[PDB]
Structure 1
Amino acid sequence: NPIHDRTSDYHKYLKVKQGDSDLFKLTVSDKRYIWYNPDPKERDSYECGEIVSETSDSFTFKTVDGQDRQVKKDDANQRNPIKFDGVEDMSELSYLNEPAVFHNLRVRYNQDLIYTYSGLFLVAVNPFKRIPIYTQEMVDIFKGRRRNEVAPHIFAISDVAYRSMLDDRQNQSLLITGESGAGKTENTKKVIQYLASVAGRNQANGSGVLEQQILQANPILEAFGNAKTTRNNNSSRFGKFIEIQFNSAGFISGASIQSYLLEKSRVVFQSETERNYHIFYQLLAGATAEEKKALHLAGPESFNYLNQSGCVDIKGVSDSEEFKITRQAMDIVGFSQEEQMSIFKIIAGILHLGNIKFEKGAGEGAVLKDKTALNAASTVFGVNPSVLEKALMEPRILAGRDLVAQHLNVEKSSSSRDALVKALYGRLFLWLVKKINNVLCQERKAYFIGVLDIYGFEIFKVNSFEQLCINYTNEKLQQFFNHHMFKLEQEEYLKEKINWTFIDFGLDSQATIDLIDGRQPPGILALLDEQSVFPNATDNTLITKLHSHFSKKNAKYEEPRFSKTEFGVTHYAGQVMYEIQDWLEKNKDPLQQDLELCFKDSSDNVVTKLFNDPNIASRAKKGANFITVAAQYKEQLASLMATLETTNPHFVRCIIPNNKQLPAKLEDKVVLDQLRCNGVLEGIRITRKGFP
């Protein structure tokens, strides 16, 4: 048994190392210590001081240096007996305070122990390096073990959700929270791997193909949906809820993926030191000479959509090698050789479209002097270069019932070219998902375990509509944890009348949530929609209306004195300033019909489905207007949350160690802000003084 064999990889990599004689001598000491702030300015940096004396309400301790301080006992962060350092469950700590919880996490982290239980949920601190703990051997160890019999691990929480699904015959969900780069996606991959193993079928010839396809579905979406941002080299630019389905016997019957709002703006713009989607780089590097030739491809520096950030490479990653993986994932899933080539023609097409350089003519209208890029794109897409040309600069619209040809200037033509690009990429992503889903859904499920992997809370120098939608989602996931951890728990106790005194844990993201998606009174999204459908509305009339409604009226809103185009929203993870530029068009997500017409007549079959298929090319109509991006997203986020409520949830809180993606550098301030806003210690207090 590996569990008990101290010489195993398990003990080696998942268990705390045996202390020595000198450590024992320290462990049996009678001295008592306290965690204090050497600087009262920096409350997150602590040192350990020894308590030398005590009055009825105070403690006098010594500081690392030559001095002595006194503190009220009710204001003291006592240090747990060292025997607790490295404990696998922090609900077991004598003293439960901030420095105490961080210290234990730090102790384990320094030994590459990234998993630690914090009551009923698991905490995960990003190692930022590889650790040999997700091997098939490790999987087999956790197979069927009770949470307290084995070490903290993502495999452990997975098996528990699994047994609960079988024992209670109820649906389960694994909610992995964390800001950008914290490790949500890696752990998500692990939960899938584990379930696929312990619950898959290992018959031969035809058998186990499903579980292999389930696994191969991730690398495809990652190539089209992930990209390098300043916070993560493999940031997920789309949200995801994966449904692992099981039959009545408890065997994987299949799975479906529900994607959420891809960043469609990234295809045409990346800020300095960021990349466009990985796929653009894997194609340009992994394509053969013929493909490269029949596609009119060149190097990254040759494409406007790939040479503006100044970054075409990611340290330690080979796009060429990555491309081989992607294509192999597509094969296994089932993408015909034809479909794939179409998929790359689109990628190549999008690249050429970004090369089209519009210029002014003799008048205000725009013209296209060089038609190389235009011709190239038209070729790979299989569309009439002249139809496409007029559809870009002179799209036709109705003026009443009259058909009027527009003559878009340079700026307008470029924006229209970008809208096409984004619609193009956006629909492709949805097609890929649809496709994969038809492969994985081959049997009526009896039960499922939902694994959520959203885009994490993020902040950049410039925050736009995209960031608001992302942080709004994180804000709701957090309230989901607060709701379940405290509100429902206590609402239960008090219902049974088990003699409980209500506790206010001070965790509530409702005010921030209402400010964003509030309807009555109208929140930010509601006002955005109003203005969005108001003809004479501008980004300036939108910000003015936003300030008007919330400035000095809502505690979570702020009208900055340093700017006229930004507004702040106080989230659980911090205040974020948002730039209002282009919000109206982003929410409208416009696309000229002449452009759609031009592509509905494409020779390529994939391209044609993206423009003739209702689910992909059609847009819901909220009456006289198309449903807005905000209204649809608010709507889809509401379904999810309603789906989660119908399951038994298990939380995994990923914690990022620092802001530099560096291993072995656990930064207190970075880590303590997360433990605080995530409500980790309150999560431990409810499990400790309550009735689980």
Structure 2
Amino acid sequence: NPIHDRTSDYHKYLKVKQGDSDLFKLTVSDKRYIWYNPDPDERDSYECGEIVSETSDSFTFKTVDGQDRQVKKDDANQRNPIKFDGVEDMSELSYLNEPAVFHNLRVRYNQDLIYTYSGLFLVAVNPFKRIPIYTQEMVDIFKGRRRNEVAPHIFAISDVAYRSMLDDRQNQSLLITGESGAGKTENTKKVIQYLASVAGRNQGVLEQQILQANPILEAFGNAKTTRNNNSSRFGKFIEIQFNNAGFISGASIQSYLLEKSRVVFQSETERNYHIFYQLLAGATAEEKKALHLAGPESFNYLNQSGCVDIKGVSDEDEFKITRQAMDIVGFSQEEQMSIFKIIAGILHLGNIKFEKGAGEGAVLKDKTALNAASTVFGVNPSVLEKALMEPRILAGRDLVAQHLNVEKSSSSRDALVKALYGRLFLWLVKKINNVLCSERAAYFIGVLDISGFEIFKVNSFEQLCINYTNEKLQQFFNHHMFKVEQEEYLKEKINWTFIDFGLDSQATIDLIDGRQPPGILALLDEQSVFPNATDNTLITKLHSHFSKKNAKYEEPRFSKTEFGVTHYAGQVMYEIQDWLEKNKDPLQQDLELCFKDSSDNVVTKLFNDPNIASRAKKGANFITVAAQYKEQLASLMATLETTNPHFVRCIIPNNKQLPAKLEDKVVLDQLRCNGVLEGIRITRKGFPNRIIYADFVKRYYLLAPVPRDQKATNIDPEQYRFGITKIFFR
């Protein structure tokens, strides 16, 4: 038993190293310590000091340098006894304080132990390096073990969810939180791997396909951002489905909010979606020929950030992986080819150069890019050109051709690319889901991997929707961990004295998505269907409604085009530029007519399938992006509310994507804003386990002298409470 064998990889990689003679000595010391701030300005940088004296209300301690300091016992952050250093469950700590919590995570991190329990949920600190803890052998160990019998691991939280599914015959969810680059997506992948393994029908196809969906989605939905070289630029809710038996019956992926604008624009040093680089790199010369491709430097859509490659990554090699995945998922050779033609057409489109013509309306002097694109997409070039520069619209009922200028024509070509891309993405997912749909699921374990909280020099509409989503997910944790928990206690009249954990994202949530009074999204929507609205009228309106009126909102004095929102993770300044267009998400209809006529089977679907091509209508207008997403999100949350949730809090160690470099301020801000300590305090202070008397009696009347057919209901009364319908236990 590797679990017992100090020589096992399990022991080696998942357990705290045996401390030494000396350590033993320090461990038995009678000395007492405190965590303190050598510099009170830097409240997150602590030192260890020996408590030398004490009064009824204070502690006197020595500082590093050796000097002595005094503190109210009240404000003291006592250091836990060293035997606690590296503890698997921080709820065991005697002293629950910031520096102590960070310390324990630091101890574990320093020996490559990235997983640590915080009471009922898991904390995962990104290592920024490979740790061999995810092998089959590793998986095998977790298999069916109680959380308590094994070390903290994403596999273990996965097993528990799985057991709870089968035990309670209830659906579950694995909610993995974190800011951008925290490790949500790596963890998610581990969750899937585990489930596939432990509930996989052995004798691995459905299962491998489930697995294989991954690289396809990431090649098309991930990109290098300044915070993450493999940033998920869309969110996903993966439903792992199981039959009555507990075997994996299927899976389903729901995608959210693809950052379509990345296809046409990328900030300095970032990348466009990986796929673009994989194709250019992994394409054959025969393919490169037929697609009229060159290197990324030859394309405006890939040659503006200053970055075409990611250290340690081989686009050409990933291309092969993407392709095999498509192969395993089942995409036909023809399908794949159309897929690449679409990518290639996008690239050429991007190369179209509009020029001012006669007067205002634009002209296209060189048709190379235009012809190349038309040729790969299987659409008519003149038709496409007219659709770009002179699209037709109704003026009342009259039909008028517009004559767009250089700026509008480019924006339109951009809009066409974005729709091509977003719809291709949706098609890839739908294609994947259809392959994976083969059973009327008895249960599911849903894994949520969203784009996490992010802040850039320029935060736009995409950032707002992302951060809003992260704010809602945090609220869901708050709700679950504290709101609902206490209500049960209070409900069951167990004499719980309500505690205010001080964590509440409601006000921020409301500021954003409130109806009445209207929040930011409501106002954006109103202005969005207002004929004379401009980004300027929009911002003015936001300010008029929230400036000096909403606590979570700020109208900055240093800018006229930005507004600030105070999220759980920090305040973010948003630039209003393009918001109406972004919310409206327009696309000239003549563009769509051009594409519905494509000789390409895939292109056709993107434009002809109402599942992909159709826009929903809200009265006299089509639905906006905001309303639409707000709705998707609300629906997600409702679904989650029907599951038994398990939280994984991913923690980023620093902002450099470096291993072995745990930054205290970095980590502490996350622990603070995620509600980690409060969450530990609740686990401690309260009563996790509870059972209705009758299901308790019925279940086991056997330990009894007691019938099977409440009050009657030895074991110690310290760890138990008597509720009004159930009894509670620790």
TM over 0.5: yes
Cα deviation, residue 62, structure 1: 0.2
Deviations 1:24-48 (A, max 9, x none): 0100000000000001100000000
Cα deviation, residue 438, structure 1: 0.4
Report the equivalent of 1:50. Answer: 50
How far apart, in 2, do the equivalents of 1:402 and 1:551 lie?
A: 43
Cα deviation, residue 308, structure 1: 0.2
How far apart, in 1, do the equivalents of 2:597 and 2:551 lie?
A: 52
How far apart, in 2, do the equivalents of 1:25 and 1:190 lie?
A: 39
How far apart, in 2, do the equivalents of 1:629 and 1:31 lie?
A: 61
Deviations 1:82-107 (A, max 9, x none): 00000000000000000000000000
How far apart, in 2, do the equivalents of 1:380 and 1:291 lie?
A: 11
Deviations 1:323-363 (A, max 9, x none): 00000000000000000000000000000000000001121
How far apart, in 1, do the equivalents of 2:171 and 2:613 lie?
A: 33
Report the equivalent of 1:582. Answer: 578
Cα deviation, residue 57, structure 1: 0.6
**1:321 is paired with a residue of what secondary structure?**
helix
Report the equivalent of 1:374. Answer: 370
Cα deviation, residue 66, structure 1: 3.1
**1:452 is paired with a residue of what secondary structure?**
strand
Which residue, 605, 610, 621 being the options, matches 2:606? 610
How far apart, in 2, do the equivalents of 1:275 and 1:670 lie?
A: 25
**2:206 is paired with a residue of what secondary structure?**
helix
How far apart, in 2, do the equivalents of 1:300 and 1:612 lie?
A: 31
**1:471 is paired with a residue of what secondary structure?**
helix
Cα deviation, residue 225, structure 1: 0.1
How far apart, in 1, do the equivalents of 2:79 and 2:67 lie?
A: 19
How far apart, in 2, do the equivalents of 1:555 and 1:357 lie?
A: 46
**2:645 is paired with a residue of what secondary structure?**
strand
How far apart, in 1, do the equivalents of 2:534 and 2:324 lie?
A: 47
TM-score w.r.t. the length of structure 2 is 0.94
The percentage of counterpart residues that share the same residue type is 99
How far apart, in 1, do the equivalents of 2:105 and 2:379 lie?
A: 58
How far apart, in 1, do the equivalents of 2:105 and 2:556 lie?
A: 38
Deviations 1:632-680 (A, max 9, x none): 0000000000000000000000000000000000000000000000000
Deviations 1:581-622 (A, max 9, x none): 000000000000000000000000000000000010000010
Deviations 1:251-284 (A, max 9, x none): 0000000000100000000000000000000000
How far apart, in 2, do the equivalents of 1:495 and 1:136 lie?
A: 45
**2:262 is paired with a residue of what secondary structure?**
coil
**1:435 is paired with a residue of what secondary structure?**
helix
How far apart, in 2, do the equivalents of 1:240 and 1:443 lie?
A: 21
Report the equivalent of 2:478. Answer: 482
Matched, 1:250 2:231: no
Cα deviation, residue 416, structure 1: 0.3
Deviations 1:115-145 (A, max 9, x none): 0000000000000000000000000000000
**2:557 is paired with a residue of what secondary structure?**
coil
Aligned residues: 688
Matched, 1:543 2:539: yes
How far apart, in 1, do the equivalents of 2:496 and 2:422 lie?
A: 51
Matches within 5 A, 1:139-154: 139-154=139-154
Matches within 5 A, 1:487-636: 487-636=483-632
Which residue, 267, 271, 287 being the options, matches 1:291? 287
**2:370 is paired with a residue of what secondary structure?**
helix
How far apart, in 2, do the equivalents of 1:364 and 1:167 lie?
A: 70
Cα deviation, residue 418, structure 1: 0.2
Deviations 1:367-407 (A, max 9, x none): 00000000000000001100001100000000010000100
How far apart, in 1, do the equivalents of 2:66 and 2:673 lie?
A: 35
How far apart, in 1, do the equivalents of 2:361 and 2:30 lie?
A: 85
How far apart, in 2, do the equivalents of 1:429 and 1:507 lie?
A: 37
How far apart, in 1, do the equivalents of 2:129 and 2:145 lie?
A: 27
Matched, 1:415 2:419: no
TM-score w.r.t. the length of structure 1 is 0.99
How far apart, in 2, do the equivalents of 1:210 and 1:638 lie?
A: 30
How far apart, in 1, do the equivalents of 2:516 and 2:359 lie?
A: 48
Cα deviation, residue 67, structure 1: 1.0
How far apart, in 2, do the equivalents of 1:352 and 1:197 lie?
A: 43
Which residue, 373, 396, 399 being the options, matches 2:395? 399
**2:31 is paired with a residue of what secondary structure?**
coil
How far apart, in 2, do the equivalents of 1:689 and 1:415 lie?
A: 57
Structure 1 runs of 4+ aligned residues shifted over 2 Å read none
Report the equivalent of 2:340. Answer: 344
Deviations 1:413-445 (A, max 9, x none): 000000000000000000000000000111110
**1:233 is paired with a residue of what secondary structure?**
coil
Report the equivalent of 2:155. Answer: 155
How far apart, in 2, do the equivalents of 1:364 and 1:73 lie?
A: 74
How far apart, in 2, do the equivalents of 1:493 and 1:23 lie?
A: 42
How far apart, in 2, do the equivalents of 1:463 and 1:443 lie?
A: 42
How far apart, in 1, do the equivalents of 2:81 and 2:309 lie?
A: 48
How far apart, in 1, do the equivalents of 2:206 and 2:644 lie?
A: 25
How far apart, in 1, do the equivalents of 2:62 and 2:202 lie?
A: 62
**2:448 is paired with a residue of what secondary structure?**
strand
Report the equivalent of 2:84. Answer: 84
Q: Which runs of 5+ in 1 are unaligned?
A: none
How far apart, in 2, do the equivalents of 1:675 and 1:261 lie?
A: 27
Moved more, 63-72 or 240-249: 63-72
Cα deviation, residue 196, structure 1: 0.2
Deviations 1:537-563 (A, max 9, x none): 000000000000000000000000000
**1:578 is paired with a residue of what secondary structure?**
strand
Report the equivalent of 2:654. Answer: 658
**1:354 is paired with a residue of what secondary structure?**
helix
Deviations 1:5-33 (A, max 9, x none): 00000000000000110110100000000
How far apart, in 2, do the equivalents of 1:32 and 1:310 lie?
A: 54
How far apart, in 1, do the equivalents of 2:282 and 2:322 lie?
A: 10
Cα deviation, residue 74, structure 1: 1.0
How far apart, in 2, do the equivalents of 1:499 and 1:450 lie?
A: 35
Report the equivalent of 2:138. Answer: 138
Q: CA RMSD in A?
A: 0.4
How far apart, in 2, do the equivalents of 1:362 and 1:601 lie?
A: 30
